[PDB]
Short mmCIF file of C-alpha atoms and ligand atoms in Angstrom, two decimals:
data_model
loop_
_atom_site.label_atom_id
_atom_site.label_comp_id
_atom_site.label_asym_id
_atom_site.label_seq_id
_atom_site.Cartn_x
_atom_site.Cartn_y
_atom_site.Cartn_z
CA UNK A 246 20.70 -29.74 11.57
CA UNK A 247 17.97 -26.46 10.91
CA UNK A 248 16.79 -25.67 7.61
CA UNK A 249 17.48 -21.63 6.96
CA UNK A 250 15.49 -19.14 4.63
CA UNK A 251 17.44 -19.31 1.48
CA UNK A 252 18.54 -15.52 0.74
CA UNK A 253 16.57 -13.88 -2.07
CA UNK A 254 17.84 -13.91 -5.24
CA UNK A 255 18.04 -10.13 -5.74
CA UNK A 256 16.65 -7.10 -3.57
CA UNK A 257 13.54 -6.73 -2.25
CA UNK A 258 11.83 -4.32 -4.40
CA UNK A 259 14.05 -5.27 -7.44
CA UNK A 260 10.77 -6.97 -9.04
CA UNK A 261 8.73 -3.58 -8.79
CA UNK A 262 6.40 -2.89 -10.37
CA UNK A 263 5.01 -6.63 -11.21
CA UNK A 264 5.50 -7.66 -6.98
CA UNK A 265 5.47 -5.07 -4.66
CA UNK A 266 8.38 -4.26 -2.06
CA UNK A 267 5.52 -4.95 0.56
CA UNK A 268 4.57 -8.17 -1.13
CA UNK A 269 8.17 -9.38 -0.67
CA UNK A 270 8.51 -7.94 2.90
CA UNK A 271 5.37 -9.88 4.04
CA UNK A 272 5.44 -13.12 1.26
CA UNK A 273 9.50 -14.10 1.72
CA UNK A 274 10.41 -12.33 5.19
CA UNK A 275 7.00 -13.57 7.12
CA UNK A 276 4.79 -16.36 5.42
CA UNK A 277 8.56 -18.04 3.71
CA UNK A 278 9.93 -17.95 7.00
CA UNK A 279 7.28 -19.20 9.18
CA UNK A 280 7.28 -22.19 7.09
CA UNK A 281 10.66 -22.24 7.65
CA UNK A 282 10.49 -21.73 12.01
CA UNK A 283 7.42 -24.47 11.41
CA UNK A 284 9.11 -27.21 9.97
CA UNK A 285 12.15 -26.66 11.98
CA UNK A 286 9.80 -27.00 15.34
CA UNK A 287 8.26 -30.04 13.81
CA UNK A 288 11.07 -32.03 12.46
CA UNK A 289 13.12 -31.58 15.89
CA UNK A 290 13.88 -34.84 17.44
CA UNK A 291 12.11 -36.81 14.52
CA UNK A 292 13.50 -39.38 11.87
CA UNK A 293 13.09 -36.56 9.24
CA UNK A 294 15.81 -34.42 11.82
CA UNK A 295 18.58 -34.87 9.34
CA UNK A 296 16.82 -35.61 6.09
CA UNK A 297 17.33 -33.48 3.22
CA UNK A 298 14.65 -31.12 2.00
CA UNK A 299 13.27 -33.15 -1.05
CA UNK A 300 13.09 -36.38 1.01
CA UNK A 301 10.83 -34.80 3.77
CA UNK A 302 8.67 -33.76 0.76
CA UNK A 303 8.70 -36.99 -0.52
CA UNK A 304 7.98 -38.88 2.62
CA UNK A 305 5.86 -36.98 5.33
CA UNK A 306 2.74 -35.84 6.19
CA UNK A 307 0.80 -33.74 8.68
CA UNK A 308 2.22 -30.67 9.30
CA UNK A 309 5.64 -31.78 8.74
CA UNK A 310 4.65 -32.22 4.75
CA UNK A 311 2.34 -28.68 4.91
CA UNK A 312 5.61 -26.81 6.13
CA UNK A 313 8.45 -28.41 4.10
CA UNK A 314 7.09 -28.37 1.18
CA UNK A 315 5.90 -24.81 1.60
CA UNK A 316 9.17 -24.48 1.58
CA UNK A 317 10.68 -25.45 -0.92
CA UNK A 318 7.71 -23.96 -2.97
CA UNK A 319 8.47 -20.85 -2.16
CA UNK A 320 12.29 -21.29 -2.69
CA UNK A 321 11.85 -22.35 -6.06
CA UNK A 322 9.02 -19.75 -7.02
CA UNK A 323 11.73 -16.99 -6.09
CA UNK A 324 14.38 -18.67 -8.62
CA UNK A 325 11.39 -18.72 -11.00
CA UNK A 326 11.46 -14.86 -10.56
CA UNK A 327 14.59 -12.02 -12.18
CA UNK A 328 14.45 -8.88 -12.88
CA UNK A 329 16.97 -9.53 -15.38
CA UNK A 330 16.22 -9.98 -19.30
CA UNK A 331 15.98 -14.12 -19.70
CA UNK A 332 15.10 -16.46 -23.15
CA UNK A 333 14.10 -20.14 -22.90
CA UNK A 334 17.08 -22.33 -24.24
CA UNK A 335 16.98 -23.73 -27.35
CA UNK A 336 15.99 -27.55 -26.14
CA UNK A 337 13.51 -25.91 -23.55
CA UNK A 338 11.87 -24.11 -26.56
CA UNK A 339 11.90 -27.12 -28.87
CA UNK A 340 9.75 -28.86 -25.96
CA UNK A 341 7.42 -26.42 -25.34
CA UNK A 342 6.66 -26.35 -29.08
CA UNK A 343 6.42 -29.51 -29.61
CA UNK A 344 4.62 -30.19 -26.75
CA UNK A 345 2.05 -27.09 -26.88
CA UNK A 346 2.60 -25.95 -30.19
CA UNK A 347 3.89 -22.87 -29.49
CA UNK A 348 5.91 -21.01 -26.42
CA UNK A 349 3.13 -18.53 -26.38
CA UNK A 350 0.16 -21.82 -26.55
CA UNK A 351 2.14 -22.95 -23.32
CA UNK A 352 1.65 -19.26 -21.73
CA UNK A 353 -1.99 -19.11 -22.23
CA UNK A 354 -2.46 -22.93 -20.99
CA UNK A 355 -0.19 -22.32 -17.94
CA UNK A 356 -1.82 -19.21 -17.03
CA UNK A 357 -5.22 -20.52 -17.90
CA UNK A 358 -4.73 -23.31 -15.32
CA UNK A 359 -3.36 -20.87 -12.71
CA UNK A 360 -6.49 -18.60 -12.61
CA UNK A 361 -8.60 -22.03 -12.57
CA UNK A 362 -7.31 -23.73 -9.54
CA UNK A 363 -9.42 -23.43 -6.68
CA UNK A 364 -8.80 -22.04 -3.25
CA UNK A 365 -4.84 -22.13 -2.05
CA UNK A 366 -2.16 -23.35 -4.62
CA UNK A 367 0.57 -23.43 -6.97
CA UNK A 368 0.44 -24.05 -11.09
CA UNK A 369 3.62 -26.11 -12.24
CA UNK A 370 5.31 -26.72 -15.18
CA UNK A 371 6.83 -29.88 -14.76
CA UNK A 372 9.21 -32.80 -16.68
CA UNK A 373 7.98 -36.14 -16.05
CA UNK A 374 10.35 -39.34 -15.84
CA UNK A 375 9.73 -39.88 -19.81
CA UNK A 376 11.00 -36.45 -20.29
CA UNK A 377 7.75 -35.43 -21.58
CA UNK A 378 6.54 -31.67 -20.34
CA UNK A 379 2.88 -31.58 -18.42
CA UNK A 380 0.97 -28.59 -16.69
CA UNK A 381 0.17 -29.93 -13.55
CA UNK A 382 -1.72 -28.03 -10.59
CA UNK A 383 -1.58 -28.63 -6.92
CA UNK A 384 -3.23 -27.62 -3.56
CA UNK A 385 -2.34 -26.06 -0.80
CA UNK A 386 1.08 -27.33 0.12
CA UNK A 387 0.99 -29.72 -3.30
CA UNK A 388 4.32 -30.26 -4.57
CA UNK A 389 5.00 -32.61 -8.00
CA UNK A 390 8.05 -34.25 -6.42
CA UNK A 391 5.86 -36.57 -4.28
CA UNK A 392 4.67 -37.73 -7.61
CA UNK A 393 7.99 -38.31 -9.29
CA UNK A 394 7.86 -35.20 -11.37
CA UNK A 395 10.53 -32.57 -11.89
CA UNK A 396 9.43 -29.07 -11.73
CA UNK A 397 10.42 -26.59 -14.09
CA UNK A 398 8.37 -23.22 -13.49
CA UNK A 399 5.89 -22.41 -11.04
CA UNK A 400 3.58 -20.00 -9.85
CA UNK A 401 1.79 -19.38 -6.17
CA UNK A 402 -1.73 -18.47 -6.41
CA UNK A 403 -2.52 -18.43 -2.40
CA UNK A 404 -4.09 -15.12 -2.23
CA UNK A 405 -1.11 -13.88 -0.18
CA UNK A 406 1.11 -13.66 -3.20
CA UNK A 407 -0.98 -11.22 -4.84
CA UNK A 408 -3.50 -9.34 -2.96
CA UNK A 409 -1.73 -6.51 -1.79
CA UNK A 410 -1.08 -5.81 -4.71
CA UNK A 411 -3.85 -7.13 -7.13
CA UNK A 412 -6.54 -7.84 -4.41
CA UNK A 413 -8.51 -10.22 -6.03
CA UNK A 414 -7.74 -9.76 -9.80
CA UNK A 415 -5.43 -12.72 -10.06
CA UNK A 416 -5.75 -13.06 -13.57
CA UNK A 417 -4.19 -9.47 -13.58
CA UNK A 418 -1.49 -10.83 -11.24
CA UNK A 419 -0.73 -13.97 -13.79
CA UNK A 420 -0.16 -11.85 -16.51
CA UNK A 421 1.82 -9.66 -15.07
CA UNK A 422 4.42 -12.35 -13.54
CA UNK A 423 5.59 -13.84 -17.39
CA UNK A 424 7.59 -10.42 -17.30
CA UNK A 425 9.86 -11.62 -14.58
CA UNK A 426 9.55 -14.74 -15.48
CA UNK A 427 13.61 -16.42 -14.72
CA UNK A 428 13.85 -18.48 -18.30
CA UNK A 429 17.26 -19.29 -17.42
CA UNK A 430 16.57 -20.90 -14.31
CA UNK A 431 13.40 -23.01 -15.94
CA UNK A 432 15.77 -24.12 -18.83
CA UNK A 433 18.92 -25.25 -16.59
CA UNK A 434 15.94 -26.99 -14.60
CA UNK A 435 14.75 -28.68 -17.86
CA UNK A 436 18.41 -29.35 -18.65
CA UNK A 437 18.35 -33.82 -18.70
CA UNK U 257 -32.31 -15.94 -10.92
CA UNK U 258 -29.49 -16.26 -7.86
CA UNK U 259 -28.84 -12.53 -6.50
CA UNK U 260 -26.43 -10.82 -4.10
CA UNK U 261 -28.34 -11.46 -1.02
CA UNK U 262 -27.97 -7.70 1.05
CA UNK U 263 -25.62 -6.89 3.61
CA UNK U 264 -26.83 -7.07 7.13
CA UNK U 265 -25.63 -3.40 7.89
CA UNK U 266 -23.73 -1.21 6.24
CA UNK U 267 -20.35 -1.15 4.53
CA UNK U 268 -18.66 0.25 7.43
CA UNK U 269 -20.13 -0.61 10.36
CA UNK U 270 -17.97 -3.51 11.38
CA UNK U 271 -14.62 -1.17 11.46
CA UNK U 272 -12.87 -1.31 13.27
CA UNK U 273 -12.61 -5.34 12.90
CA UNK U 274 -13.49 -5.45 9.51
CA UNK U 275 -12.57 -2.69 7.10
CA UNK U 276 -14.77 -1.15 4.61
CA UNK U 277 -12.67 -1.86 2.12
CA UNK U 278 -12.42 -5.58 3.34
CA UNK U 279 -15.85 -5.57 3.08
CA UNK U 280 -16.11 -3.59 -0.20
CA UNK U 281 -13.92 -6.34 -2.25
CA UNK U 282 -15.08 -9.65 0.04
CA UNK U 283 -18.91 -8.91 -0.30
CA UNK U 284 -18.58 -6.69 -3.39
CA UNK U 285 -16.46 -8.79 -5.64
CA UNK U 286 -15.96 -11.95 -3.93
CA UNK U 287 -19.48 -12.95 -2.95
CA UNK U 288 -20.67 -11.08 -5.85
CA UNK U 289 -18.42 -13.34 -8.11
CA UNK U 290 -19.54 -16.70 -6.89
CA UNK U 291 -23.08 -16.12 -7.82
CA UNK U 292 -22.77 -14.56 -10.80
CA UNK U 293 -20.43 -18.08 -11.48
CA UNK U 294 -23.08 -20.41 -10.14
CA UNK U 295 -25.81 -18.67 -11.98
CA UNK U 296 -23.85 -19.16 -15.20
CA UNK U 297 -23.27 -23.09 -14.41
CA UNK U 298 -26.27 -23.56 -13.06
CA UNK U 299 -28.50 -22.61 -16.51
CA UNK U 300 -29.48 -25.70 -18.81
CA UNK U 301 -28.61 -28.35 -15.84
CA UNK U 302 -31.15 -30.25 -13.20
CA UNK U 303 -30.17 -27.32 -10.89
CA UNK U 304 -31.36 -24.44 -12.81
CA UNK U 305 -34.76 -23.51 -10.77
CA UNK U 306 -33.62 -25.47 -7.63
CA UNK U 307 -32.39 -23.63 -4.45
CA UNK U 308 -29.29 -22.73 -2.89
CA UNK U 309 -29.20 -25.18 -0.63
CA UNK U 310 -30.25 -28.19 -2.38
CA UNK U 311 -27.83 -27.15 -4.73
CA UNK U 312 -25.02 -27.26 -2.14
CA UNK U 313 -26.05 -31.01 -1.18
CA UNK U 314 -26.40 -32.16 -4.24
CA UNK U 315 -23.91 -31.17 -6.72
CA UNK U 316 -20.46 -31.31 -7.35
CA UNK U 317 -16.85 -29.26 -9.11
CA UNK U 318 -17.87 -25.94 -9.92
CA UNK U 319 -21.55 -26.30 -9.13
CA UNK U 320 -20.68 -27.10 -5.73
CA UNK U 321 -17.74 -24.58 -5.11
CA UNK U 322 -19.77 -21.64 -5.97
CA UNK U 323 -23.19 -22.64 -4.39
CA UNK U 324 -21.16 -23.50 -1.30
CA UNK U 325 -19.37 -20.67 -1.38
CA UNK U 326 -22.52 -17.93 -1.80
CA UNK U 327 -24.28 -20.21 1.18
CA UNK U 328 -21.53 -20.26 3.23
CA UNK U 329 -20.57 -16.05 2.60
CA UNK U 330 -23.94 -15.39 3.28
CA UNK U 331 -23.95 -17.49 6.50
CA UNK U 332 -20.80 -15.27 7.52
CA UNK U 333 -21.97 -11.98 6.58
CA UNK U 334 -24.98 -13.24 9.18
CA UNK U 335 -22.34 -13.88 12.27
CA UNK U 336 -21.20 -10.42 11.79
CA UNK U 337 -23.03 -7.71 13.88
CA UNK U 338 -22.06 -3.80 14.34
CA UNK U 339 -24.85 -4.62 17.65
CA UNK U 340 -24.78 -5.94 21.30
CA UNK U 341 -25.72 -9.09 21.26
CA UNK U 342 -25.56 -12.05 23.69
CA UNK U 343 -26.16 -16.22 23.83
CA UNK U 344 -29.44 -17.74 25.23
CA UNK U 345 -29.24 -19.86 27.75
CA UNK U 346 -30.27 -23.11 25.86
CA UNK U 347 -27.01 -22.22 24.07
CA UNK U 348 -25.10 -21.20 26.42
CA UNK U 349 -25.93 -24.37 28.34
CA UNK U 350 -24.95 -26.72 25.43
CA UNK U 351 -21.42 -24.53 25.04
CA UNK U 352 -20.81 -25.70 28.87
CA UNK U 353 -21.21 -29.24 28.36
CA UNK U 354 -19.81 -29.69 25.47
CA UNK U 355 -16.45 -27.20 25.84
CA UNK U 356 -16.44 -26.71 29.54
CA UNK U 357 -17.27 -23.45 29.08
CA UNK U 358 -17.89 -20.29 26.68
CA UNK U 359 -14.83 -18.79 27.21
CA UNK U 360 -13.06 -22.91 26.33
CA UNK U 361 -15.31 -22.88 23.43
CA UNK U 362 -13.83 -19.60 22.25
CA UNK U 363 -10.34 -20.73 22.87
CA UNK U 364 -11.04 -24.16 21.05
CA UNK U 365 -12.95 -22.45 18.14
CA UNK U 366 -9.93 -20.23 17.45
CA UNK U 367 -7.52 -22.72 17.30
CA UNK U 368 -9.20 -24.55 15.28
CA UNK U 369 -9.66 -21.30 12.76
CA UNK U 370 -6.16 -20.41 12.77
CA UNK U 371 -5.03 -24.11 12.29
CA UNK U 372 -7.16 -24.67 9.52
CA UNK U 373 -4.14 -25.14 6.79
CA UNK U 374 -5.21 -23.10 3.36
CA UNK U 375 -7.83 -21.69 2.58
CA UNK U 376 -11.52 -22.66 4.36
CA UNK U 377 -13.58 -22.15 7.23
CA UNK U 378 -14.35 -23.09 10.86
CA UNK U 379 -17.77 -23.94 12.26
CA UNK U 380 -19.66 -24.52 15.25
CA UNK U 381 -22.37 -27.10 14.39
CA UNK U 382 -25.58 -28.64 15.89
CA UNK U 383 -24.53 -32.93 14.61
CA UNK U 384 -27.17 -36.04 14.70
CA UNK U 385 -26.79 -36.61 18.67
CA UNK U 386 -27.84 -33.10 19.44
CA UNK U 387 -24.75 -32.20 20.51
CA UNK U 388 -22.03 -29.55 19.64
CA UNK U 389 -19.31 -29.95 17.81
CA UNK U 390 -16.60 -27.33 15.79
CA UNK U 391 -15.52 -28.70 12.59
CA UNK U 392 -13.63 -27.09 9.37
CA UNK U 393 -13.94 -27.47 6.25
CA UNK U 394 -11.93 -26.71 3.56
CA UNK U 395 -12.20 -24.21 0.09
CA UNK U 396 -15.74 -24.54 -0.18
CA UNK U 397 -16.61 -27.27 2.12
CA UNK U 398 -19.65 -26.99 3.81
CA UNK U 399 -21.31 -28.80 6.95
CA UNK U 400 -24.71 -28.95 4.76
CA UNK U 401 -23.01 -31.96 2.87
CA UNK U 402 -22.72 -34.02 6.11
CA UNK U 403 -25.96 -33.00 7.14
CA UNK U 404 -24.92 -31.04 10.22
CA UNK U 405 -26.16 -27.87 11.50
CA UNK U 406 -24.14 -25.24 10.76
CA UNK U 407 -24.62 -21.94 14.07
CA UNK U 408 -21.49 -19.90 13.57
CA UNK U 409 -18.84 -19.45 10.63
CA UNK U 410 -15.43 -17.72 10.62
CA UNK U 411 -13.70 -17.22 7.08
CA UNK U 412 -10.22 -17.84 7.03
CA UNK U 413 -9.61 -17.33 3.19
CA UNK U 414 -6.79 -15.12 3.15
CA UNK U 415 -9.18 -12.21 1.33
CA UNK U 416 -11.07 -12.63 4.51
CA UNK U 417 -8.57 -10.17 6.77
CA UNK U 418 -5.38 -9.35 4.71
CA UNK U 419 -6.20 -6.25 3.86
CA UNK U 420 -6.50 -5.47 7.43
CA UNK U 421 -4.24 -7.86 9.28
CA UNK U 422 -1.85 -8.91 6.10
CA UNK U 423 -0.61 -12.54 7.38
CA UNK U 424 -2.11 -11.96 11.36
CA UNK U 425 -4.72 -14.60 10.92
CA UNK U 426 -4.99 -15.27 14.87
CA UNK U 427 -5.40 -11.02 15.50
CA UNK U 428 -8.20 -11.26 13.03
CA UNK U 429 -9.67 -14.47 14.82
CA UNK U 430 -9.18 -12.46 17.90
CA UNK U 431 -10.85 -9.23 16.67
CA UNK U 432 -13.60 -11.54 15.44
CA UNK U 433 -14.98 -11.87 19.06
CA UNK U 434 -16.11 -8.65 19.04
CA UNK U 435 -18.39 -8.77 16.34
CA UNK U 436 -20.38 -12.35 16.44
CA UNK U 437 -23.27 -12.32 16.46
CA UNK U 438 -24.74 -14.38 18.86
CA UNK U 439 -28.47 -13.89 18.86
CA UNK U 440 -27.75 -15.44 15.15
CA UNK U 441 -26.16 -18.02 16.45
CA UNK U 442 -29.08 -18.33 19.67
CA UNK U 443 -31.38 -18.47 16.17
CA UNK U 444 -29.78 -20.77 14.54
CA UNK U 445 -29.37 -23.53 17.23
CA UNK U 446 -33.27 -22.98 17.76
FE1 LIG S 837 3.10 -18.22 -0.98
FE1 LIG S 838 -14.58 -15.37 1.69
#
């Protein structure tokens, strides 16, 4: 039928004072939904009408692809976010270690990569099919399910997410967003 | 050796389209940033002594992205005018044939601004038939690197108007209007 904005996980100033109240009021209730009112405009009367979420990701292009997976970006970068005290599981540790070498080697890598990537997009922490765990960076609307990959973490680096309240210090905003970083939902993601 | 090239008028004088403090981060960190980058990458390779715009049409990665990026701010920052200003008729002329009309061209050139998807840019440019044409391009992408002529810009990087229009990228496109500068253009297209 229509897709709906998923409701946010907790309140909207409830990850104060890393995002901003305003941040959340113009990133989730305006740019969220109009990918949202976008891909329900642009699906209508299609083959992808009907077609869960993932599959449209999977399968379109245009401006179908741009809006779907927009949003399910942003849906998953909101369960990446709590302001409630998290830990990494003890398997999801065990791979980042082994992996990266460390938890805190996979922090600087991941937010290394999110500074570098150019322009609009999103740094991932994703599980490919072998299980192993990979960094990967997209563009734009860039999601790692059209390449078979599971992700685990992510972060938006559009400038929307952050200028209000960084302007154009992103590294400032990457920092800052390991603090409400949701380990539980990464780990139950990570979880087979 | 690259600098900061100055501002065509003062930090202010394109409010109320353009905020000082738009222009304070875009021109004073932003622009600033991307050659203080290129000049950096630039050092101890072919391109170190070359200019800007050579630069843009021949390199690539992060050589590219930051020359394009100073040429293409700078290009901007020249579209921009606090002043009256109006089209010649030579371009004028070719906006008729090609679009129809000035006021079609304006309608066309906005859509195309505000449906350019991520960050980039929209251009009117002079291509190899002498003719008109709007293109975007996107992150850094500039018309240079096709060999077209490049007569107007508008940024639609989100740093470009959030501070003063937050997600409202067609009000900023709108408010845009009042501030091109079209005798740069008129030059441009000489
Ligand atoms: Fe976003
Ligand atoms: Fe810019």
């Amino acid at each position: 039928m229509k897709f709906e904005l998923p409701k946010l996980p907790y309140a909207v100033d409830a990850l104060e004072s890393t995002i901003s109240k305003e941040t959340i009021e113009y990133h989730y209730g305006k740019h969220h939904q109009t990918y949202v009112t976008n891909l329900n405009n642009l699906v209508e009367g299609t083959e992808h009408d009907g077609r869960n979420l993932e599959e449209i990701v999977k399968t379109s292009n245009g401006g179908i692809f741009n809006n779907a997976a927009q949003v399910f970006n942003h849906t998953f970068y909101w369960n990446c976010l709590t302001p409630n005290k998290t830990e990494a599981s003890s398997q999801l540790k065990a791979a980042l270690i082994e992996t990266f070498g460390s938890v805190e080697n996979f922090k600087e890598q991941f937010s290394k990569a999110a500074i570098a990537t150019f322009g609009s997009g999103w740094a991932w922490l994703v599980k490919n099919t072998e299980g192993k765990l990979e960094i990967v960076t997209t563009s734009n609307a860039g999601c790692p399910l059209t390449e078979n990959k599971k992700p685990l973490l992510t972060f938006d680096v559009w400038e929307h997410a952050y200028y209000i309240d960084y302007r154009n210090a992103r590294p400032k905003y990457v920092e800052a967003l390991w603090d409400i970083v949701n380990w539980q939902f990464v780990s139950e993601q990570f979880a087979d």
